Design a protein around this ligand. Structure first.
Ligand SMILES: Nc1ncnc2c1ncn2[C@@H]1O[C@H](COP(=O)(O)OP(=O)(O)OP(=O)(O)O)[C@@H](O)[C@H]1O
Ligand SMILES: Nc1ncnc2c1ncn2[C@@H]1O[C@H](COP(=O)(O)OP(=O)(O)OP(=O)(O)O)[C@@H](O)[C@H]1O
Lengths: 415, 420
């Protein structure tokens, strides 16, 4: 196919001038220090799709470090060097990070081709040359341009997933972000690497990251679902079986995470999802998952809390009951515990349980009473904190005045 | 002779990064709109000389306006377009703006554009398009002349074409401590004698002249101008004699001092004070009209040439302060210098101390006006009696009210009512 294309006009019309100007300069600096300068990866992809990107990757043929020190000279910002693998990032204003790398060991200067070929999918393996001579040059050896037109996710070569099974995850994320489809050959390859154990063959940490990145997408459920279609989940969490049920939970989970965030703050989605994936895990199967990925040791208790009390919750919800009855179930629990509870309901029940949650957040108001009256009268320890709890509940449902309710339960519990 | 050299290394080393990046961007734009882009004029001269320069003077082979318009898409600022004659200006901050013009009518049409300029060292260019980014272009041998410090017109008619360049050539001579190579010297004299300055408008000459007086040695520029007999051809009745000269010397040694105690000094006028001395009624008319001088300047100037002798015998015999006041009472700072133009040594240290006395011994402390108005009195006598007190103060004093009474008293030679 056409391998070279002029996207210079495309550049000036779609690229904000502060940024287009930075390209013209990087290109000239490249020429001044005698190195080919390319912008590569995601920006090239998004540019052709009309998507904005402010995370731009430069590849030079030469020395990133040199090239980047030479650039700092003429550009305002902070330079971070990473010597071990000649690489660098220049930090510019307005969320704008410019990363520079050195391409390793087809006119000739086509060593970018060896750089491009090492990448994951064709839409992500294209390059735009920035040196003034060839300023707008779209370099596309692998048919990523057409693959953008035809909405196709495609690996560069047969051994792609075997080299990095982490791309199994990447393929699905991108195919779900853009509504593309993983082409036949890649799908056979993807399926095969999953089936054979390639994921189980890759480190927890890299899997976790690729997982988190999915959870930072617009619609993670899409990807989780697609994963389930490719048996990927079974192989990440060996005791998790993604059934109509789990998936119904996952949908509720995702529906309610906003509403939670809005009222309780940051939700760590990786933990929120694990609450679902991991329900009903035996003790042993839990340690292995908790060790493969690094999972806060108390998690399995928190999950076990939700999976144990869920029918009771459901039950209380039907039969609308006194808020004080559900309090013990949401006591001092993570936003993920709350999310996990919400995973279990929809419609009327859902909102109903919402209102309880609010009633609990907001009505923690013990107000006038402040623990003084308690150790003013005689008290020690645990009793202090049990009278304080009985006062608390009485409020949630109705109310008394200041402390009739206090002497109500020191003389009701006195019995 | 070598025309092309590569000053790109010198560019990154000497030019400010904001500006360099401008230069690179500008070159890059030209390539995008198919126009050769050069930086020209004095920036090139100054770069080469290590002298700071912010002027961004640009010439393109294509169309200043289309170019300037294209550049504006990517550069924040006001675009003024000098639509007649195809020039533009791109306005940016820091005191910074880009002047873009069209290389008038091989890429080496810049040669024709470089050929119209004044002197070799101002006739160069640096190309900016990325393929030739730091490329010096010296068809006319401005590098050689820059290094040898030589002022040399580009061709034979240069002075006939623009007599302004005669004053320019001197100005530069003295700014860079350069000298005017002989053929340009011979060629200038010729242009001056044949009467070419007078053939070209007053403003144009006036501007070049004010410009000369802002430079490093105005004195030097003037004695030099005198050598080529240009003064005589600018102000027909000014004859640069050693009298005329020694006045000018003092003028300039004193301006610093004047400017110190009194304030800004207009050098152009401060010079004309000396040039225009002794111009008859009919001659002042012509000069004043041509260079757009103040109707009144002649008066101020005549004032000094007349009252000048009197001042000397006032300093020999250090007569009390009062006796000189009438002579410097409302006059301009230029007038003050004009007077100072006559004094050397101990005559000036004395005359200087007098001026300083009157400056801040105005000192009308409590006897201000309507005090005297509360006795009888009405206009123009008020002013006279007030003055006579202040005047007595210049040379010692009393209460400030005892003196007014000694003076109304002295009044009775006559005023108009009262006075036991
Ligand atoms: N695991 C991988 N295998 C092969 N190539 C990769 C891999 N990760 C990244 N790349 C290459 O690095 C480029 C940038 O990495 P990055 O994760 O930022 O990709 P991206 O396209 O920006 O994805 P995102 O938009 O999710 O940030 C990609 O466009 C791709 O060429
Ligand atoms: N009177 C003139 N005749 C011919 N060419 C001129 C004349 N004045 C200027 N030029 C050309 O245009 C350029 C810009 O004019 P300008 O007076 O700003 O020069 P400059 O070198 O910047 O000197 P200055 O220090 O006075 O700014 C000159 O350097 C010269 O190349």
């Amino acid at each position: 196919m056409q391998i070279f294309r002029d996207v210079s006009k495309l550049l000036v019309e779609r690229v904000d001038p502060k940024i287009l100007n930075l390209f013209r300069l990087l290109g000239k600096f490249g020429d001044e220090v005698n190195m080919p300068v390319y912008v590569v990866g995601g920006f090239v992809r998004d540019l052709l799709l009309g998507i904005k990107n402010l995370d731009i990757d430069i590849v030079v043929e030469g020395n990133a470090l040199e090239f980047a020190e030479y650039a700092k000279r003429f550009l305002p910002g902070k330079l971070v060097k990473h010597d071990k693998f000649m690489t660098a990032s220049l930090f510019l204003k307005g969320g704008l990070r410019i990363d520079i790398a050195t391409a390793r060991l087809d006119v000739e200067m086509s060593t970018i081709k060896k750089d491009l070929y090492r990448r994951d999918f064709t839409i992500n393996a294209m390059a735009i040359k920035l040196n003034p001579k060839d300023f707008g040059l779209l370099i596309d050896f692998f048919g990523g341009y057409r693959d953008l037109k035809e909405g196709v996710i495609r690996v560069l070569h047969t051994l792609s997933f075997v080299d990095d099974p982490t791309r199994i995850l990447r393929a699905i994320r991108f195919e779900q972000r853009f509504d593309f489809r993983i082409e036949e050959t890649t799908e056979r390859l993807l399926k095969q690497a999953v089936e054979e154990g390639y994921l189980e063959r890759t480190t927890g940490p890299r899997l976790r990251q690729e997982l988190e990145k999915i959870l930072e997408e617009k619609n993670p459920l899409k990807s989780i679902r697609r994963m389930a279609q490719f048996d990927v989940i079974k192989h990440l969490f060996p005791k998790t079986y993604y059934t109509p049920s789990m998936d119904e939970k996952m949908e509720n989970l995702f529906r309610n995470i906003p509403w939670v965030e809005e009222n309780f703050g940051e939700v760590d989605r990786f933990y929120a999802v694990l609450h679902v994936f991991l329900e009903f895990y035996d003790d042993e199967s839990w340690k292995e998952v908790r060790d493969r990925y690094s999972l806060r040791r108390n998690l399995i208790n928190e999950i076990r809390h939700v999976e144990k009390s869920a029918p009771a919750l459901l039950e209380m919800l039907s039969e609308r009951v006194p808020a004080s009855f559900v309090y013990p179930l949401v006591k001092g629990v993570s936003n993920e515990t709350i999310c996990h509870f919400l995973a279990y309901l929809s419609g009327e029940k859902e909102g109903l349980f919402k209102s309880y949650l609010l009633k609990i957040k907001n009505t923690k108001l013990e107000k006038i009473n402040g623990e003084y009256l308690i150790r003013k009268g005689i008290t020690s320890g645990k009793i202090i904190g049990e009278v304080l709890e009985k006062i608390l509940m009485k409020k949630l449902d109705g109310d008394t005045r200041d402390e009739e309710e206090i002497l109500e339960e020191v003389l009701a519990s006195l019995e």
